[PDB]
Every structure is written in C-alpha cells, then in structure tokens.
Amino acid sequence: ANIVGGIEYSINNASLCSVGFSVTRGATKGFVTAGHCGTVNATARIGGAVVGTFAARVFPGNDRAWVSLTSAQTLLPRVANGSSFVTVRGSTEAAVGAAVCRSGRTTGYQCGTITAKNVTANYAEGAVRGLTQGNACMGRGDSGGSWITSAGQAQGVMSGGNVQSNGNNCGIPASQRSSLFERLQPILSQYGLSLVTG
Hints:
Protein name: Alpha-lytic protease
Strand content: over 45%
Keywords: serine protease, low temperature, hydrolase
Radius of gyration: 15 Å
Helix content: under 10%
Assembly: monomeric
Number of domains: 2
Structural class: mainly beta
Distance between the termini: 19 Å
PDB class: serine protease
Strand order of the largest sheet: 3-2-6-7-8-5-4-17
CATH class of the largest domain: Mainly Beta
Family: Belongs to the peptidase S1 family.
C-alpha cells in the first residue's frame, strides 16, 4: 500500500485509526501514529492487506506509536487533503497562534489555529500530558492522523478532543473546540525516526 498521512488503517481487524507520517528507521519503513491506536505487535491493515505491526508505543502518559512496515510498502512525503496532497517538507514546530491543519479518516482535512501547548488530557486510561491544542475540528477515528501546516511542517499526531454526541467537535464553534495532538519531535527522537520529506 501507499503510505499517506490521514488515511485509514485497522488494528487487529478491529479498531480504525489514521496514519500520521511516513518515516524511516535505518532500512526499516514505518509510520508514526497515536499510541492509543494499538499495542506492541498489533497488526495494521490498509485496503484489506497486512502492512506491518506496532513496533512500539507509549500510552497513556504520552500518546505515541510507530508501525514497522514490510518492505513492500510505499512511503510517501504526503498528507491527504481531499483527493489532493500536502507535501511534508520538515518538522519545524509552529508557535501558538499559527494556522494548522489535520487529516484523518473520519472528518478528513480540517484547519484552524494552535491555541495552547502543554495541555493535559484526562482519558479513560489515565492522563496524557504535554499535548498541543488546536481548534481545527476532529472526530472519533481521526486518531493518529497528521497535524501539519499548509507550508508542510509536520506538527504531530491526533490524540484526542472534546467530541460531542455526534462523535466529533465540528458542530460547535472553533472557540469551543479542544483538539489535541501529540508533538512529533519527541516521537521521532524517542524511536530514532526520520521523517520522509519532499
């Protein structure tokens, strides 16, 4: 399969999440995603085919993971925006106030701004600290998906947010949204990963 940020993948033929970013670890191909999406060794599938397994994850506390892919997979420096693509050019972290977008299999490509950093989320499993908050909307299933600026700077992966009864927070104003992502930089260094760029 072609690995693009924002696309759907399943975990152990059960839960669905979204791809964060194509990365390499030496000769090994992979993609970063959210830790809550799967446990170590869990099988990832795209288009009905096995593409790899969860190599490592930290959740709760943090919310990160990377899926180690088979060499048959095709890594791409891109994030889905409708039928088009946003090129991944680097991982410069944007400041509070910056515009930012996210991509996922539930709500697609959504944009907003970064409103706060170092935010704690109290999830069912425990607290996750150090998350960055934006007001682009999201929904259940967008988890693990790419957060990236229009200029191509990869920011992080979708962790969680204040989803309403309809499963997303797109039906409430941006001012009331808390959409949280796990910063990309600590994921890359923790697992010795290099972002695939173009």
